[PDB]
Design a protein around this ligand. Structure first.
Ligand SMILES: [Cl-]
Ligand SMILES: [Cl-]
Ligand SMILES: [Cl-]
Ligand SMILES: [Cl-]
Ligand SMILES: [Cl-]
Ligand SMILES: [Cl-]
Ligand SMILES: [Cl-]
Ligand SMILES: [Cl-]
Lengths: 223, 216
């Protein structure tokens, strides 16, 4: 029932910083040793630092010079600010609560991991186009429809369907890296054919680096 | 960071037992408990073992941890395809104000998985994209194994190499691979050919899907 909710702008280029926050629900702000870690496929997992509710911190020695972890007990949140960032700081960043200072050790609580890309090239938002229902390749009684998410930078984008109410049969494919250096991906969902033209289908595309959200309605092709 | 040493890789066939080792020192594993995490791409690590051998809720009992001297061991019995991941030990280290140290990680491969054929879905360009004076053909390939495909595109029956972008196959949640290929065209090219085809080859078999401009 303990929840760790990630938020924050991520990369801020005008100050070359990376800022993330984590809000704790279902537990006291004194319940865990609040920590930040990051991970990258080739570099492995790295502990960045931890903070107690009192405000005392401990840092990975190789980050101490440019990392500050803070806690706001009033808002039940803790935060990370990494300064003078470069592309080497691209990683999946995760907040967690560790058990180092609890007598009753019941396991750590882990937030969500968020890919944050640090980049110096210009940000590019996506253009989203509907992929109208096609029955040719699906099982009897179903059809595949989707959304094409074109020419964005950097990763990631997230795609949900009908604001999260539709999850069954959703497959969001990995993005392609174009020769241009931009990304495109496609998200397809398989739905009942009998539902087409009465059930509305909308893909919700979010590209946080560009602050762009598109809700694209996907309709059957006609006329 | 100090050093927790782990073998780079481990592997087995389905049903086997695979053990992953973690080698530390007196000041970390010698005086501290060990945790084990499972790491899949793009998400937070998942806690498998804490306090040397205790499993959080929802972790199957076929994951078991033990601890000895300055080392620790994770045992995965009943090895399944979904166990393919990176596994990291971790422990506090009594240095400075205290450091949390992750191991170097072990990649687990499940061997002997049977081959699986691809499903191919080919989408023509949307009408709205055409109205924006672009055209993209979308060839989506899923459910195949092992993770290798060849994708070739045709205009009518002639090969097309320009404007093609294809991903490297990667494993999806269903433990099979997916890939996608994109063909960029001007609207005039799309409208002026009889059809375009996406041709997927895998393990000596070929699937070809074909689309054509709509005429009302
Ligand atoms: Cl410190
Ligand atoms: Cl850089
Ligand atoms: Cl547009
Ligand atoms: Cl990753
Ligand atoms: Cl051991
Ligand atoms: Cl095949
Ligand atoms: Cl097929
Ligand atoms: Cl198809």
């Amino acid at each position: 029932q303990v929840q760790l909710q990630e938020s924050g702008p991520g990369l801020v280029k005008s100050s070359e910083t990376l800022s993330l926050s984590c809000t704790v629900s279902g537990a006291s702000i004194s319940s865990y040793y609040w920590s930040w870690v990051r991970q990258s496929p080739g570099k492995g997992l790295e502990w960045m630092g931890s903070i107690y509710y009192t405000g005392t911190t401990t840092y990975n020695p190789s980050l101490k010079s440019r990392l500050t972890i803070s806690v706001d007990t009033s808002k039940n949140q803790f935060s990370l600010k990494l300064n003078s960032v470069t592309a080497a700081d691209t990683a999946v960043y995760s907040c967690a609560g560790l058990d180092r200072f609890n007598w009753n050790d019941e396991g750590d609580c882990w937030g969500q991991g968020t890919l944050v890309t640090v980049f110096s090239a210009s940000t590019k938002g996506p253009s989203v186009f509907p992929l109208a229902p096609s029955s040719k390749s699906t099982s009897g009684g179903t059809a595949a429809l989707g959304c094409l998410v074109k020419d964005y930078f950097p990763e990631p984008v997230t795609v949900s369907w009908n604001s999260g109410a539709l999850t069954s049969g959703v497959h969001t494919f990995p993005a392609v890296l174009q020769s241009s250096g931009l990304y495109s991906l496609s998200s397809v969902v398989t739905v009942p054919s009998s539902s087409l033209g009465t059930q509305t289908y909308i893909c919700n595309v979010n590209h946080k680096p560009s602050n762009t959200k598109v809700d694209k309605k996907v309709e059957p092709k006609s006329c | 960071q100090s050093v927790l040493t782990q073998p780079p890789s481990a592997s087995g066939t389905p049903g086997q037992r695979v053990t992953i080792s973690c080698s530390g020192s007196r000041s970390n594993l010698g005086r501290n408990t060990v945790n084990w995490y499972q790491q899949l791409p793009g998400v937070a690590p998942k806690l498998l073992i804490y306090s040397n051998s205790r499993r959080p809720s929802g972790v199957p009992d076929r994951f078991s941890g033990s601890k000895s001297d300055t080392s620790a061991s994770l045992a995965i019995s009943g090895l399944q395809s979904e166990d393919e991941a990176d596994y990291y030990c971790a422990a506090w280290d009594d240095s400075l104000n205290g450091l949390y140290v992750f191991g170097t990680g072990t990649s687990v491969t499940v061997l002997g998985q049977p081959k699986a054929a691809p499903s191919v879905t080919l989408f023509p360009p949307s009408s709205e994209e055409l109205q924006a004076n672009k055209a993209t053909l979308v060839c989506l390939i899923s459910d195949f194994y092992p993770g290798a495909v060849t994708v070739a595109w045709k205009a009518d029956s002639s090969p097309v190499k320009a404007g093609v972008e294809t991903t490297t196959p990667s494993k999806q949640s269903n433990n099979k691979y997916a890939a996608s290929s994109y063909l960029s065209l001007t609207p005039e090219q799309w409208k002026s050919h009889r059809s375009y085809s996406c041709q997927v080859t895998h393990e000596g078999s070929t699937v070809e899907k074909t689309v054509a401009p709509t005429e009302c």
